[PDB]
Symmetry: C3
C-alpha cells in the first residue's frame, strides 16, 4: 500500500494528506491559470503517479472550491497504468473568473477500489 | 457493516435505501431552498454519519433529478472520519429555478471502497 | 469476475476496454443526438448489464470529451441489480452544439467497489 509519484518539473508539489483517514491526497497546480466564467482549463500538476494495484485514481473536487467558488472537476478517471503527467480538468461555473496560482491546491486524488471484470455477451440477462 | 447516523435537529430524515442492492442511501433536505438557474446551494441534511472503515462517503446525484431537471452534485467527498453535518452541494444547470422542500430527497450517499496508501517520492517511475 | 451484457437492439455496440488495467469499459451511443450548448441529453446504449457482486456501475466521463468539448456526465449511478437499458446523461457545457452519432463512444463504465451497510440511528455519534 504505497502510492508512488515523481516530479516531472521543479514546479510540482508533493501530494499531501493531512488526516490519516482523508479520502484523498491534495493535488497542486504547477502553473498559473486564469479560468473565465463558464470556461474550463486543463491544469498540470507536473507529477506522474503509480497507483496501487486494484484501484484507479479519481481526480475529485475540493469541497471548499465547489461550495464557495462553483468549481467542479471534469474528466477525472486516471487509469491504474497511466504514467503521464496528471492533469486536472477544472470547470468554472461561477460568474467571476477563477485564478489558479502555482502551488494552489486544486483537487484531490482518491484511490478508488474497482473490479477489472472480463466481459461476456449473452442474448438476454437471467 | 453498519452505517451509523444521528439527527442534529428535528428536521432531519433518517436515510433510506429501498433495495438491498441499491448503491446509495437517500439523503433528505432538512430545509427549504430556492436554487436559481445556473446557481448552486449547500443543502443541509442535519445528520451526522459514521462511515464504515475502508470507505469514504460519496454524495452522488439522484438519476431523475439529473435527467429531468439538470441538477448535479458538486463537492461530494465525505471523509471516513467526518462527524459534522452532512451537506449536499447542488448545482442547478437548468433554465428554471429548482425548489427544494424540507423532506425532499436530494442526493444519495454511497460507501465507496478506497485504499489509504502511504505516499513515496521517487525520481522517476519504473 | 464477469461483467455480462445483452444487446437490446441491433444498434448497440458491445462495450470494449483496450487496456487490461483501464478503469472502464467504453459505452457507445445506439442513436444520433444533437446536444445544444448548455443542454443535456439522455443517450441510450441499448444494452442491459449484470454487474459483478460487490460493486455498482458508475457511468463516468471520457477524458478527451471533457477537456476538448466541455462534455460532462450527469447522474451515473447504476445499481448492481439494474437490468434496464443503460442510459448516459450527457451535459454539454460548451458554446457549440455537440453531435453524437450512433456508434460513438460517449462514456465509460466503471465497476466501483462499495459496501452495502445496514443503517443504525443513534442519538449522538461517539
Ligand atoms: C486533453 C486530454 N487528453 S486525454 O488523452 O484524453 C487524457 C490524457 C491524460 O490521461 C490521464 N488523465 C485522465 C483524466 C484526468 O482527469 N486526468 C488525467 O491526467 C486530457 C484530459 C484530462 C487531463 C489531461 O491532462 C493533460 C495534462 C498533461 C498531460 C495530460 C488531458
Ligand atoms: C462550505 C464548505 N465547507 S468545507 O469545509 O469545505 C467542507 C465541510 C463539510 O465537509 C463534509 N462534506 C464534504 C463534501 C460534501 O459534499 N459534503 C460534506 O458534508 C462545504 C462544502 C460542502 C458541503 C458543506 O456542507 C455544510 C453543511 C453544514 C456543514 C457543512 C460545506
Ligand atoms: C429519466 C431517468 N430515469 S430514472 O428512473 O431516474 C433512472 C432510469 C435508469 O436507471 C439506471 N441508470 C442510472 C443512472 C444512469 O446514469 N444511467 C442509468 O441507466 C434517467 C436517468 C438516467 C439515465 C436514464 O436512461 C434511460 C435510457 C433508457 C432507460 C433509461 C434515465
Ligand atoms: Zn518552468
Ligand atoms: Zn428549525
Ligand atoms: Zn432502430
Amino acid at each position: 500500500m504505497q502510492l508512488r509519484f515523481a516530479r516531472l518539473s521543479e514546479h510540482a508539489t508533493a501530494p499531501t494528506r493531512g488526516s490519516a483517514r482523508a479520502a484523498g491526497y491534495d493535488l497542486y497546480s504547477a502553473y498559473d491559470y486564469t479560468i473565465p466564467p463558464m470556461e474550463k482549463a486543463v491544469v498540470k500538476t507536473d507529477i506522474q503517479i503509480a497507483l496501487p494495484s486494484g484501484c484507479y485514481g479519481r481526480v475529485a473536487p475540493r469541497s471548499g472550491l465547489a461550495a464557495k467558488h462553483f468549481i467542479d472537476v471534469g474528466a477525472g478517471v486516471i487509469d491504474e497504468d497511466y504514467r503521464g503527467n496528471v492533469g486536472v480538468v477544472l470547470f468554472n461555473f461561477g460568474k467571476e473568473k477563477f485564478e489558479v496560482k502555482k502551488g494552489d491546491r486544486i483537487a484531490q486524488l482518491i484511490c478508488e477500489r474497482i473490479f477489472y471484470p472480463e466481459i461476456e455477451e449473452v442474448q438476454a440477462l437471467d
